Amino acid sequence: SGFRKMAFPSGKVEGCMVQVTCGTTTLNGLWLDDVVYCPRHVICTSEDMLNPNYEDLLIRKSNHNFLVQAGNVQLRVIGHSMQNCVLKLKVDTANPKTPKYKFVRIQPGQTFSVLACYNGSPSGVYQCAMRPNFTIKGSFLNGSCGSVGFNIDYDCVSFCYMHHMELPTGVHAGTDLEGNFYGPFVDRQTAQAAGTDTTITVNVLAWLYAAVINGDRWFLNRFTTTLNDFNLVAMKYNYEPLTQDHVDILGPLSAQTGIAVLDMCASLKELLQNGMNGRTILGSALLEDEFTPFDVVRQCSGVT
Amino acid sequence: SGFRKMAFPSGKVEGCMVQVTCGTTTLNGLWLDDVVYCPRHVICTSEDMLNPNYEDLLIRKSNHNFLVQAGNVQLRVIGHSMQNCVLKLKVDTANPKTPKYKFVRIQPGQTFSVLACYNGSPSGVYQCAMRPNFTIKGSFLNGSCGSVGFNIDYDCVSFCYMHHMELPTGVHAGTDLEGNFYGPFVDRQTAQAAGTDTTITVNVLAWLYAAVINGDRWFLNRFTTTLNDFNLVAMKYNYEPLTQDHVDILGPLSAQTGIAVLDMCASLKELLQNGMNGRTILGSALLEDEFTPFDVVRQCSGVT
Ligand SMILES: CC(=O)NCCc1c[nH]c2ccc(F)cc12
Ligand SMILES: CC(=O)NCCc1c[nH]c2ccc(F)cc12
């Protein structure tokens, strides 16, 4: 029993983190096989960041201009290329600690672990979600760029995020490991505004299921609803619309608890309309939306 | 910017986790040097748990009755002893991945990371606090016993907790790595009740400082208070008394933000008396007390 915001164990990713320096700029890189992946803005002066032409700035860079350090040992860079907003640095040594891995581009509402690093050194791990506006709410100081987001399926690390920037509002934007930004963000020091940060409805429902499983039942009501009726209320409260795909995904939690998905929807509807009235659910005074249905099943079943 | 509930990177502890089996009971062990540490209740049938005499149950156990598996390789047990509520199993192989380490007994209010394991395999990491009633609110299913709590100072893992049991209320109790329970709990399947789970005041104040540093300032008020006046309000709201030691500990956050500790106390006092009025602080609708002053400094300064 008990339900915690839980990151993946980080060791497999710790063994991939390196320091990348280009001139006076130091940030983090991800060393998989004989490639180091890092934000392309590693080549920029904070002067360059105002309006960078990456292709033009890259012409002024050779292999030897990229200093890659893994622990306190320098890696030899034998190649570099720009793919979208990341640099791939070919090094002469395959990372001996390379785990089984994939690059995945996640959808909004998907959760992942972040290993926050500075100078190629891990400082902490926490659980995030890709927000519906394609931001994440992280904890990232100067030097944390190139810190990565990941999921683990048994022994395979799926890398889904690399950190590139803070928006003026203090929320975070980054790329997949092919260097494509989540959302409409660009690696330029220009005022960029996020859209509406809506609540990830399917995740709130997963977490209400988690609460019932852990004995927090006070919010269970005598009502049901329909997807259309629920969605009218969702829209009004800046919740993402619930689809039949979301209902299907919640089916195992429905089965485990014997609470029909639409019944839990009606309970959530009353929570939106009535508020918490000073009560808590799993130690939270607000509806948590950074657990996926898969996360709730995993934590409630004890997958390793 | 951004402030996250952040665990220590877990790799150093992942390399210490083993499976311990005694008969039909499997749980987790911690392999440091040539010793495996695990809950002594590994020797019990759930029948034994109702009223175990550990010394008597141990007479029926030899070295070869303790099956220790590290990955999919068996370790040879060459010795066993009971220290308080843990077993120390001497094995013939020093853990090659043993990190620099200490055993520390933490005080209530101290935070630590837990690597939740099943069958000696890490499933997740999360941040806990030792509650003032010497419980923790974890996420622990059957098979998670022997999962450990830890802090990291650069390259030295301080082990502070080993998981032993759930109370009937679904909160958690365990030992330090010398096998001494936190609080008055015993490794027996008998109804045990926790005392008052009071709020860790110094930690709430640290987290309010974290909020000011991250631009969440709406709750900053025009008042100050005294320790005695604040404490009267604290007592009434089941908050731990604030000592001058707590004020000293908050001094660096006071300095960084230019908000006198007693001023932040007066802001907290008004938050207790007035509530949040539907507002959030660092994305929370309740006052977070599972960050220490040290945690706030670490995360806000980016220590690795
Ligand atoms: C807070 C703010 O001004 N954000 C605008 C984007 C921005 C500023 N500095 C950067 C450095 C690297 C990068 F890729 C993007 C940026
Ligand atoms: C929920 C509940 O009944 N808790 C009482 C203690 C208890 C039950 N099962 C156990 C197994 C091992 C152990 F060390 C303690 C216990």
mmCIF file of N, CA, C and O in Angstrom, chain A residues 1-12 14 115-116 118 121-128 137-141 166 170 172 280 283-286 290 299-304, chain B residues 1-12 14 115-116 118 121-128 137-141 166 170 172 280 283-286 290 299-304:
data_model
loop_
_atom_site.group_PDB
_atom_site.id
_atom_site.type_symbol
_atom_site.label_atom_id
_atom_site.label_comp_id
_atom_site.label_asym_id
_atom_site.label_seq_id
_atom_site.Cartn_x
_atom_site.Cartn_y
_atom_site.Cartn_z
ATOM 1 N N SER A 1 0.856 -1.212 0.000
ATOM 2 C CA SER A 1 0.000 0.000 0.000
ATOM 3 C C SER A 1 0.888 1.256 0.000
ATOM 4 O O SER A 1 2.149 1.170 0.132
ATOM 5 N N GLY A 2 0.241 2.406 -0.124
ATOM 6 C CA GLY A 2 0.930 3.675 -0.366
ATOM 7 C C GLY A 2 1.122 3.850 -1.852
ATOM 8 O O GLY A 2 1.232 2.830 -2.600
ATOM 9 N N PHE A 3 1.113 5.095 -2.290
ATOM 10 C CA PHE A 3 1.262 5.448 -3.716
ATOM 11 C C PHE A 3 2.124 6.696 -3.780
ATOM 12 O O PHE A 3 1.777 7.701 -3.164
ATOM 13 N N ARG A 4 3.247 6.586 -4.468
ATOM 14 C CA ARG A 4 4.288 7.631 -4.501
ATOM 15 C C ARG A 4 4.520 8.036 -5.950
ATOM 16 O O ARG A 4 4.488 7.158 -6.835
ATOM 17 N N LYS A 5 4.808 9.312 -6.171
ATOM 18 C CA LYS A 5 5.384 9.783 -7.444
ATOM 19 C C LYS A 5 6.773 9.150 -7.535
ATOM 20 O O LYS A 5 7.617 9.431 -6.668
ATOM 21 N N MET A 6 6.943 8.235 -8.480
ATOM 22 C CA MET A 6 8.071 7.286 -8.488
ATOM 23 C C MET A 6 8.791 7.451 -9.820
ATOM 24 O O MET A 6 8.098 7.367 -10.847
ATOM 25 N N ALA A 7 10.102 7.703 -9.803
ATOM 26 C CA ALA A 7 10.920 7.691 -11.034
ATOM 27 C C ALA A 7 11.422 6.272 -11.272
ATOM 28 O O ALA A 7 11.502 5.477 -10.303
ATOM 29 N N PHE A 8 11.761 5.956 -12.514
ATOM 30 C CA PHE A 8 12.583 4.772 -12.837
ATOM 31 C C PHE A 8 13.920 4.867 -12.104
ATOM 32 O O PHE A 8 14.494 5.942 -11.869
ATOM 33 N N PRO A 9 14.475 3.694 -11.724
ATOM 34 C CA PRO A 9 15.840 3.646 -11.212
ATOM 35 C C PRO A 9 16.710 4.260 -12.324
ATOM 36 O O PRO A 9 16.452 3.995 -13.481
ATOM 37 N N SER A 10 17.661 5.095 -11.954
ATOM 38 C CA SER A 10 18.418 5.949 -12.897
ATOM 39 C C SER A 10 19.791 5.377 -13.267
ATOM 40 O O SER A 10 20.414 5.945 -14.166
ATOM 41 N N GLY A 11 20.261 4.296 -12.625
ATOM 42 C CA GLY A 11 21.637 3.810 -12.836
ATOM 43 C C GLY A 11 21.975 3.655 -14.313
ATOM 44 O O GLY A 11 23.094 4.017 -14.703
ATOM 45 N N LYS A 12 21.073 3.080 -15.105
ATOM 46 C CA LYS A 12 21.317 2.759 -16.530
ATOM 47 C C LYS A 12 21.578 4.057 -17.302
ATOM 48 O O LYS A 12 22.349 4.024 -18.277
ATOM 49 N N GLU A 14 22.592 7.036 -15.647
ATOM 50 C CA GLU A 14 23.785 7.600 -14.999
ATOM 51 C C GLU A 14 25.027 7.191 -15.803
ATOM 52 O O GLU A 14 25.935 8.014 -15.955
ATOM 53 N N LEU A 115 16.724 12.522 -15.259
ATOM 54 C CA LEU A 115 17.965 12.565 -14.468
ATOM 55 C C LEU A 115 18.584 13.928 -14.697
ATOM 56 O O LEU A 115 19.190 14.159 -15.771
ATOM 57 N N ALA A 116 18.380 14.836 -13.747
ATOM 58 C CA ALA A 116 18.948 16.194 -13.770
ATOM 59 C C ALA A 116 20.449 16.045 -13.558
ATOM 60 O O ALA A 116 20.860 15.419 -12.543
ATOM 61 N N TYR A 118 24.475 18.154 -13.979
ATOM 62 C CA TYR A 118 25.343 19.344 -14.121
ATOM 63 C C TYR A 118 26.771 18.848 -14.337
ATOM 64 O O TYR A 118 27.179 17.954 -13.603
ATOM 65 N N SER A 121 27.344 15.137 -14.470
ATOM 66 C CA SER A 121 27.197 14.475 -13.155
ATOM 67 C C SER A 121 25.742 14.543 -12.701
ATOM 68 O O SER A 121 25.164 15.630 -12.595
ATOM 69 N N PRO A 122 25.125 13.371 -12.461
ATOM 70 C CA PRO A 122 23.743 13.296 -11.976
ATOM 71 C C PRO A 122 23.565 13.943 -10.604
ATOM 72 O O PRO A 122 24.349 13.645 -9.746
ATOM 73 N N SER A 123 22.563 14.809 -10.432
ATOM 74 C CA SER A 123 22.235 15.423 -9.125
ATOM 75 C C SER A 123 20.921 14.862 -8.585
ATOM 76 O O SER A 123 20.778 14.828 -7.380
ATOM 77 N N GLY A 124 19.998 14.411 -9.437
ATOM 78 C CA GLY A 124 18.707 13.962 -8.909
ATOM 79 C C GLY A 124 17.859 13.337 -9.964
ATOM 80 O O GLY A 124 18.132 13.569 -11.159
ATOM 81 N N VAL A 125 16.832 12.613 -9.537
ATOM 82 C CA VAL A 125 15.852 12.041 -10.480
ATOM 83 C C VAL A 125 14.437 12.372 -9.987
ATOM 84 O O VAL A 125 14.143 12.333 -8.736
ATOM 85 N N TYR A 126 13.569 12.687 -10.941
ATOM 86 C CA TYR A 126 12.153 13.025 -10.665
ATOM 87 C C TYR A 126 11.323 12.610 -11.865
ATOM 88 O O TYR A 126 11.873 12.426 -12.956
ATOM 89 N N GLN A 127 10.017 12.534 -11.628
ATOM 90 C CA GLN A 127 8.993 12.092 -12.594
ATOM 91 C C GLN A 127 8.345 13.356 -13.144
ATOM 92 O O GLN A 127 8.121 14.301 -12.367
ATOM 93 N N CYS A 128 8.149 13.390 -14.453
ATOM 94 C CA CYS A 128 7.555 14.507 -15.214
ATOM 95 C C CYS A 128 6.404 13.944 -16.024
ATOM 96 O O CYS A 128 6.362 12.733 -16.196
ATOM 97 N N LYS A 137 7.217 20.607 -16.535
ATOM 98 C CA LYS A 137 7.496 21.423 -15.338
ATOM 99 C C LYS A 137 8.580 20.645 -14.608
ATOM 100 O O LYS A 137 8.272 19.628 -13.951
ATOM 101 N N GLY A 138 9.814 21.075 -14.806
ATOM 102 C CA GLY A 138 11.001 20.368 -14.336
ATOM 103 C C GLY A 138 11.661 21.148 -13.238
ATOM 104 O O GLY A 138 11.078 22.106 -12.706
ATOM 105 N N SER A 139 12.876 20.747 -12.938
ATOM 106 C CA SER A 139 13.768 21.457 -12.020
ATOM 107 C C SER A 139 15.107 21.484 -12.731
ATOM 108 O O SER A 139 15.748 20.408 -12.805
ATOM 109 N N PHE A 140 15.420 22.617 -13.361
ATOM 110 C CA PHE A 140 16.577 22.757 -14.279
ATOM 111 C C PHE A 140 17.254 24.101 -14.045
ATOM 112 O O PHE A 140 16.617 25.123 -14.318
ATOM 113 N N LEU A 141 18.479 24.080 -13.510
ATOM 114 C CA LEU A 141 19.320 25.290 -13.323
ATOM 115 C C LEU A 141 20.223 25.429 -14.547
ATOM 116 O O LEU A 141 20.192 24.530 -15.393
ATOM 117 N N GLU A 166 14.534 26.915 -20.662
ATOM 118 C CA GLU A 166 13.432 27.477 -19.842
ATOM 119 C C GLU A 166 12.727 28.551 -20.672
ATOM 120 O O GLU A 166 13.424 29.299 -21.376
ATOM 121 N N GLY A 170 9.251 30.078 -16.741
ATOM 122 C CA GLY A 170 9.938 29.099 -15.878
ATOM 123 C C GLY A 170 9.506 27.656 -16.115
ATOM 124 O O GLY A 170 9.839 26.806 -15.281
ATOM 125 N N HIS A 172 9.547 24.356 -19.037
ATOM 126 C CA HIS A 172 10.707 23.757 -19.728
ATOM 127 C C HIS A 172 10.302 23.213 -21.087
ATOM 128 O O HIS A 172 9.177 22.766 -21.255
ATOM 129 N N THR A 280 -8.097 15.516 1.263
ATOM 130 C CA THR A 280 -6.940 15.095 0.455
ATOM 131 C C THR A 280 -7.241 13.736 -0.162
ATOM 132 O O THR A 280 -8.072 12.969 0.386
ATOM 133 N N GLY A 283 -2.782 12.036 -0.175
ATOM 134 C CA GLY A 283 -1.941 13.086 0.427
ATOM 135 C C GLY A 283 -1.859 14.336 -0.435
ATOM 136 O O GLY A 283 -1.000 15.188 -0.145
ATOM 137 N N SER A 284 -2.715 14.470 -1.454
ATOM 138 C CA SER A 284 -2.733 15.658 -2.350
ATOM 139 C C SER A 284 -4.043 16.419 -2.165
ATOM 140 O O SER A 284 -5.105 15.758 -2.048
ATOM 141 N N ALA A 285 -3.968 17.759 -2.144
ATOM 142 C CA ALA A 285 -5.151 18.649 -2.097
ATOM 143 C C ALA A 285 -5.582 19.009 -3.523
ATOM 144 O O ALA A 285 -6.608 19.691 -3.690
ATOM 145 N N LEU A 286 -4.842 18.589 -4.539
ATOM 146 C CA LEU A 286 -5.327 18.796 -5.925
ATOM 147 C C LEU A 286 -5.270 17.464 -6.665
ATOM 148 O O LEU A 286 -4.667 16.508 -6.155
ATOM 149 N N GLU A 290 -0.024 13.463 -13.232
ATOM 150 C CA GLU A 290 1.318 13.009 -13.742
ATOM 151 C C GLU A 290 1.539 11.532 -13.348
ATOM 152 O O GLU A 290 2.692 11.082 -13.289
ATOM 153 N N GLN A 299 2.980 0.466 -10.603
ATOM 154 C CA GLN A 299 3.294 0.708 -9.173
ATOM 155 C C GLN A 299 2.407 -0.160 -8.284
ATOM 156 O O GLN A 299 2.897 -0.594 -7.207
ATOM 157 N N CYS A 300 1.160 -0.391 -8.695
ATOM 158 C CA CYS A 300 0.170 -1.141 -7.887
ATOM 159 C C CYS A 300 0.427 -2.656 -8.038
ATOM 160 O O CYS A 300 0.019 -3.394 -7.133
ATOM 161 N N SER A 301 1.163 -3.099 -9.069
ATOM 162 C CA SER A 301 1.474 -4.529 -9.349
ATOM 163 C C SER A 301 2.949 -4.860 -9.050
ATOM 164 O O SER A 301 3.245 -6.056 -8.875
ATOM 165 N N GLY A 302 3.850 -3.865 -9.028
ATOM 166 C CA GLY A 302 5.245 -3.995 -8.544
ATOM 167 C C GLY A 302 6.221 -4.467 -9.618
ATOM 168 O O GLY A 302 7.200 -5.162 -9.262
ATOM 169 N N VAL A 303 5.991 -4.093 -10.880
ATOM 170 C CA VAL A 303 6.881 -4.448 -12.027
ATOM 171 C C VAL A 303 8.294 -3.933 -11.712
ATOM 172 O O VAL A 303 8.395 -2.861 -11.080
ATOM 173 N N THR A 304 9.329 -4.661 -12.152
ATOM 174 C CA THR A 304 10.774 -4.312 -12.013
ATOM 175 C C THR A 304 11.459 -4.370 -13.390
ATOM 176 O O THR A 304 12.575 -3.849 -13.572
ATOM 177 N N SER B 1 15.159 27.196 -12.882
ATOM 178 C CA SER B 1 13.876 27.389 -12.161
ATOM 179 C C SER B 1 13.071 26.079 -12.189
ATOM 180 O O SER B 1 13.459 25.082 -12.877
ATOM 181 N N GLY B 2 11.957 26.085 -11.471
ATOM 182 C CA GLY B 2 11.187 24.869 -11.202
ATOM 183 C C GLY B 2 11.744 24.202 -9.968
ATOM 184 O O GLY B 2 12.969 24.345 -9.671
ATOM 185 N N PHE B 3 10.874 23.534 -9.234
ATOM 186 C CA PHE B 3 11.240 22.842 -7.982
ATOM 187 C C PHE B 3 10.462 21.539 -7.946
ATOM 188 O O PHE B 3 9.237 21.567 -8.031
ATOM 189 N N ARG B 4 11.188 20.436 -7.881
ATOM 190 C CA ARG B 4 10.620 19.081 -8.008
ATOM 191 C C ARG B 4 10.977 18.289 -6.758
ATOM 192 O O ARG B 4 12.100 18.450 -6.241
ATOM 193 N N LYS B 5 10.074 17.416 -6.329
ATOM 194 C CA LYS B 5 10.399 16.354 -5.360
ATOM 195 C C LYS B 5 11.387 15.427 -6.071
ATOM 196 O O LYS B 5 11.019 14.835 -7.098
ATOM 197 N N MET B 6 12.627 15.417 -5.601
ATOM 198 C CA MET B 6 13.770 14.875 -6.359
ATOM 199 C C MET B 6 14.423 13.809 -5.490
ATOM 200 O O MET B 6 14.739 14.140 -4.335
ATOM 201 N N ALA B 7 14.589 12.587 -6.004
ATOM 202 C CA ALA B 7 15.377 11.545 -5.315
ATOM 203 C C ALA B 7 16.836 11.678 -5.737
ATOM 204 O O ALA B 7 17.112 12.238 -6.827
ATOM 205 N N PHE B 8 17.747 11.173 -4.918
ATOM 206 C CA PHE B 8 19.136 10.906 -5.340
ATOM 207 C C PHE B 8 19.130 9.938 -6.521
ATOM 208 O O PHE B 8 18.283 9.042 -6.664
ATOM 209 N N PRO B 9 20.124 10.093 -7.424
ATOM 210 C CA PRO B 9 20.344 9.100 -8.470
ATOM 211 C C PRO B 9 20.564 7.771 -7.726
ATOM 212 O O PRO B 9 21.219 7.776 -6.703
ATOM 213 N N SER B 10 19.974 6.699 -8.217
ATOM 214 C CA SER B 10 19.883 5.408 -7.499
ATOM 215 C C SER B 10 20.935 4.388 -7.947
ATOM 216 O O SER B 10 21.029 3.350 -7.289
ATOM 217 N N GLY B 11 21.713 4.651 -9.009
ATOM 218 C CA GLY B 11 22.624 3.636 -9.569
ATOM 219 C C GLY B 11 23.500 2.993 -8.502
ATOM 220 O O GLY B 11 23.693 1.770 -8.554
ATOM 221 N N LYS B 12 24.069 3.788 -7.597
ATOM 222 C CA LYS B 12 25.035 3.313 -6.580
ATOM 223 C C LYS B 12 24.346 2.297 -5.664
ATOM 224 O O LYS B 12 25.027 1.377 -5.179
ATOM 225 N N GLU B 14 21.391 0.592 -6.665
ATOM 226 C CA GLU B 14 20.981 -0.485 -7.576
ATOM 227 C C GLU B 14 22.045 -1.591 -7.550
ATOM 228 O O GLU B 14 21.680 -2.770 -7.582
ATOM 229 N N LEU B 115 14.828 3.265 -2.862
ATOM 230 C CA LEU B 115 14.813 2.418 -4.065
ATOM 231 C C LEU B 115 13.936 1.224 -3.750
ATOM 232 O O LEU B 115 14.388 0.299 -3.032
ATOM 233 N N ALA B 116 12.690 1.268 -4.211
ATOM 234 C CA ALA B 116 11.713 0.178 -4.050
ATOM 235 C C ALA B 116 12.190 -0.971 -4.929
ATOM 236 O O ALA B 116 12.400 -0.753 -6.154
ATOM 237 N N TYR B 118 11.769 -5.446 -5.723
ATOM 238 C CA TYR B 118 11.075 -6.750 -5.640
ATOM 239 C C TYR B 118 12.013 -7.807 -6.222
ATOM 240 O O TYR B 118 12.572 -7.549 -7.281
ATOM 241 N N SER B 121 15.393 -6.691 -7.422
ATOM 242 C CA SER B 121 15.338 -5.897 -8.669
ATOM 243 C C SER B 121 14.653 -4.560 -8.401
ATOM 244 O O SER B 121 13.512 -4.519 -7.928
ATOM 245 N N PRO B 122 15.363 -3.449 -8.672
ATOM 246 C CA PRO B 122 14.807 -2.102 -8.504
ATOM 247 C C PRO B 122 13.606 -1.844 -9.411
ATOM 248 O O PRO B 122 13.715 -2.132 -10.571
ATOM 249 N N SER B 123 12.499 -1.325 -8.872
ATOM 250 C CA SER B 123 11.310 -0.944 -9.668
ATOM 251 C C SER B 123 11.163 0.576 -9.715
ATOM 252 O O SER B 123 10.624 1.058 -10.690
ATOM 253 N N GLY B 124 11.647 1.315 -8.715
ATOM 254 C CA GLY B 124 11.417 2.763 -8.730
ATOM 255 C C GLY B 124 12.159 3.458 -7.639
ATOM 256 O O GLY B 124 12.563 2.780 -6.673
ATOM 257 N N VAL B 125 12.284 4.772 -7.763
ATOM 258 C CA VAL B 125 12.893 5.588 -6.694
ATOM 259 C C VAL B 125 11.979 6.786 -6.402
ATOM 260 O O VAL B 125 11.380 7.411 -7.352
ATOM 261 N N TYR B 126 11.872 7.111 -5.119
ATOM 262 C CA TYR B 126 11.046 8.244 -4.639
ATOM 263 C C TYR B 126 11.679 8.790 -3.372
ATOM 264 O O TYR B 126 12.473 8.090 -2.735
ATOM 265 N N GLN B 127 11.255 10.001 -3.026
ATOM 266 C CA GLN B 127 11.749 10.790 -1.882
ATOM 267 C C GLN B 127 10.725 10.624 -0.768
ATOM 268 O O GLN B 127 9.516 10.619 -1.062
ATOM 269 N N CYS B 128 11.209 10.401 0.444
ATOM 270 C CA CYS B 128 10.417 10.193 1.672
ATOM 271 C C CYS B 128 10.910 11.188 2.704
ATOM 272 O O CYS B 128 12.002 11.711 2.522
ATOM 273 N N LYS B 137 5.710 7.405 4.694
ATOM 274 C CA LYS B 137 4.576 7.150 3.785
ATOM 275 C C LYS B 137 5.238 6.782 2.466
ATOM 276 O O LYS B 137 5.725 7.681 1.749
ATOM 277 N N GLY B 138 5.323 5.487 2.220
ATOM 278 C CA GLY B 138 6.069 4.925 1.099
ATOM 279 C C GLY B 138 5.121 4.333 0.097
ATOM 280 O O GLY B 138 3.903 4.558 0.173
ATOM 281 N N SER B 139 5.689 3.564 -0.803
ATOM 282 C CA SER B 139 4.948 2.756 -1.773
ATOM 283 C C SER B 139 5.630 1.402 -1.743
ATOM 284 O O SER B 139 6.766 1.311 -2.268
ATOM 285 N N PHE B 140 5.035 0.454 -1.018
ATOM 286 C CA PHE B 140 5.658 -0.855 -0.700
ATOM 287 C C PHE B 140 4.613 -1.957 -0.810
ATOM 288 O O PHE B 140 3.676 -1.946 -0.006
ATOM 289 N N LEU B 141 4.759 -2.836 -1.807
ATOM 290 C CA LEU B 141 3.897 -4.032 -1.987
ATOM 291 C C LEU B 141 4.579 -5.211 -1.298
ATOM 292 O O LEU B 141 5.703 -5.030 -0.820
ATOM 293 N N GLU B 166 4.307 -2.785 6.827
ATOM 294 C CA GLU B 166 3.148 -1.863 6.770
ATOM 295 C C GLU B 166 2.389 -1.976 8.093
ATOM 296 O O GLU B 166 2.266 -3.101 8.604
ATOM 297 N N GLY B 170 -1.651 1.430 6.696
ATOM 298 C CA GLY B 170 -0.992 1.526 5.379
ATOM 299 C C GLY B 170 0.210 2.463 5.356
ATOM 300 O O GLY B 170 0.666 2.795 4.256
ATOM 301 N N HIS B 172 4.302 3.051 6.885
ATOM 302 C CA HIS B 172 5.456 2.131 6.796
ATOM 303 C C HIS B 172 6.392 2.326 7.975
ATOM 304 O O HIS B 172 6.513 3.432 8.482
ATOM 305 N N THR B 280 -2.251 27.773 -5.257
ATOM 306 C CA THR B 280 -1.199 26.743 -5.194
ATOM 307 C C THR B 280 0.137 27.423 -4.926
ATOM 308 O O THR B 280 0.305 28.626 -5.250
ATOM 309 N N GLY B 283 2.902 24.382 -7.349
ATOM 310 C CA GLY B 283 1.995 23.375 -7.927
ATOM 311 C C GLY B 283 1.333 22.505 -6.871
ATOM 312 O O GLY B 283 0.735 21.482 -7.249
ATOM 313 N N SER B 284 1.412 22.882 -5.590
ATOM 314 C CA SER B 284 0.788 22.115 -4.477
ATOM 315 C C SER B 284 -0.326 22.945 -3.845
ATOM 316 O O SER B 284 -0.129 24.174 -3.670
ATOM 317 N N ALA B 285 -1.451 22.295 -3.511
ATOM 318 C CA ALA B 285 -2.578 22.920 -2.780
ATOM 319 C C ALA B 285 -2.388 22.719 -1.273
ATOM 320 O O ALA B 285 -3.198 23.241 -0.486
ATOM 321 N N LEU B 286 -1.370 21.985 -0.849
ATOM 322 C CA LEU B 286 -1.084 21.908 0.603
ATOM 323 C C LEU B 286 0.388 22.236 0.828
ATOM 324 O O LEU B 286 1.156 22.293 -0.144
ATOM 325 N N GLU B 290 8.204 17.665 2.992
ATOM 326 C CA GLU B 290 9.208 16.578 2.711
ATOM 327 C C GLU B 290 10.357 17.157 1.855
ATOM 328 O O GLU B 290 11.053 16.393 1.172
ATOM 329 N N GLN B 299 18.988 21.612 -4.287
ATOM 330 C CA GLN B 299 18.251 21.648 -5.574
ATOM 331 C C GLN B 299 18.339 23.039 -6.193
ATOM 332 O O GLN B 299 18.382 23.123 -7.450
ATOM 333 N N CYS B 300 18.347 24.084 -5.364
ATOM 334 C CA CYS B 300 18.340 25.488 -5.836
ATOM 335 C C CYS B 300 19.770 25.897 -6.254
ATOM 336 O O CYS B 300 19.881 26.829 -7.059
ATOM 337 N N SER B 301 20.813 25.171 -5.823
ATOM 338 C CA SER B 301 22.242 25.460 -6.130
ATOM 339 C C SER B 301 22.828 24.437 -7.123
ATOM 340 O O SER B 301 23.855 24.765 -7.744
ATOM 341 N N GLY B 302 22.238 23.238 -7.250
ATOM 342 C CA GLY B 302 22.549 22.248 -8.309
ATOM 343 C C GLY B 302 23.707 21.320 -7.955
ATOM 344 O O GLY B 302 24.432 20.897 -8.885
ATOM 345 N N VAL B 303 23.872 20.988 -6.671
ATOM 346 C CA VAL B 303 24.938 20.061 -6.184
ATOM 347 C C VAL B 303 24.779 18.722 -6.921
ATOM 348 O O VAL B 303 23.621 18.343 -7.198
ATOM 349 N N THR B 304 25.895 18.038 -7.207
ATOM 350 C CA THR B 304 25.964 16.695 -7.856
ATOM 351 C C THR B 304 26.816 15.744 -6.997
ATOM 352 O O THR B 304 26.782 14.513 -7.180
#
